[PDB]
From a paper:
Charcot–Marie–Tooth disease (CMT) is the most common inherited peripheral polyneuropathy in humans, and its different subtypes are linked to mutations in dozens of different genes. Mutations in ganglioside‐induced differentiation‐associated protein 1 (GDAP1) cause two types of CMT, demyelinating CMT4A and axonal CMT2K. The GDAP1‐linked CMT genotypes are mainly missense point mutations. Structural analysis of GDAP1 indicates that CMT may arise from disruption of specific intra‐ and intermolecular interaction networks, leading to alterations in GDAP1 structure and stability, and, eventually, insufficient motor and sensory neuron function.
Here, we describe the biochemical and structural properties of the Finnish founding CMT2K mutation H123R and CMT2K‐linked R120W, both of which are autosomal dominant mutations. The disease variant proteins retain close to normal structure and solution behavior, but both present a significant decrease in thermal stability. Using GDAP1 variant crystal structures, we identify a side‐chain interaction network between helices ⍺3, ⍺6, and ⍺7, which is affected by CMT mutations, as well as a hinge in the long helix ⍺6, which is linked to structural flexibility.
Author numbering:
A (entry chain A), B (entry chain A): 23 to 164, 197 to 302
Amino acid sequence: EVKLILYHWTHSFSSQKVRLVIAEKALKCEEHDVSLPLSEHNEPWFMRLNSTGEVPVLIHGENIICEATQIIDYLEQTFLDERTPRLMPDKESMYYPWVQHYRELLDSLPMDAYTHGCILHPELTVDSMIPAYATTRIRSQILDHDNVKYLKKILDELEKVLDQVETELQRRNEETPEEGQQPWLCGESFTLADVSLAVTLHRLKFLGFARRNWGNGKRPNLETYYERVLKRKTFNKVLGHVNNILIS
Amino acid sequence: EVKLILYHWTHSFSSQKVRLVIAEKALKCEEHDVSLPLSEHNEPWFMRLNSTGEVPVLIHGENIICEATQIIDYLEQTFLDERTPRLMPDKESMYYPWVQHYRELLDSLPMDAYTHGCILHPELTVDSMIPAYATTRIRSQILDHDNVKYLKKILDELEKVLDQVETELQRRNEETPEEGQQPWLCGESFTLADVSLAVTLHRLKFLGFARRNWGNGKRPNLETYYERVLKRKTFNKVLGHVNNILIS
């Protein structure tokens, strides 16, 4: 039969979203982790995050797509079996603009900039999971140069995106009955915007910028969202150990 | 050992150049032809040329590149063994500007536009190898719309690129002794610009625009170049039967 194939770096933002979509849609893929346990210079996966995560690539028989966003879209378009769950509304529906908006909003964030801003400029992190011995190595080894001003700017922009999200989630909470199917950001169905939000929050925690953005009575609906998605079966299967620096 | 892998459409301009580079550099790859012998609608490979040729993808252990030009560059950069022949001059050399210039010159051509301009607007072709039954199917089935003016414009631009090439080849002929190692476009070494020129000319013949551009005393040095490269072992191994509509 025509088989799905994927070549990816397990510890990569792109691959994380793609694999989560493959699991949400119940699709069976032949995932191949191409990442090395240790680099030529014996850099673990966390010290290697600076290195490009290598955009993933899907091979569906004859078709070939190589980009997280594109591969995700292709999976949605090609697998239309009634059993396969859909992670997007119908184009005609009045949901699609909102869903796509928030997906883009969260996909526009410069995660690559953050990942380098915690290794560097580590004072802006809180409870970062990246070993500090990587900071010194990167700082001395020497992409955009290190400007605390720049890093502080994009993090203030991250606050804006997450503030919008927090508002929408609060609206969801007000609408839903206490005892009832709790909805996600856009609706009761797990959308593509939810896979972006979920992976974003998870990576942010690895960087330590999570505590600053939500917690201790800040963005409470966002805090609840994160604890909820951490328990989801799909999340713990794909992204479960992706933040553990020991497992690699 | 770290192995090379490639997923490609045998009858695709991109894959043709890449596979030719892999052969010129003597590298061993695990090429996988993903193209189908016949489509879902039973369209042979030539009637399927309209369909995107699917950019190829190289997987070198941990590294992943998915674009003809990029994959070619990567192969040049990563395989630096003395045995591996180099298809480019040294960056410092005064050759590199010229070589890269002609490579870009020939890579800028809109081959995708030509491939659709011969199926459509077939009067501009001469001895086209595409069965004419594909023309009628495409013309009625209905990317940029069909304007004879547009097609005639880009073909006049193709004449300019090939006229430059013809001039450079004439200079090569004047420099070289009759009895001596005949040089290619840029020098005695087979460059990346030569793989572009070679595959370009070969595809053009499949489209029928070859006769118009060279032949019968027109661009004689270019005609000689084409007959010469057709005999090259690397060419007949990779691109040998890529223009034969029977072999598929």
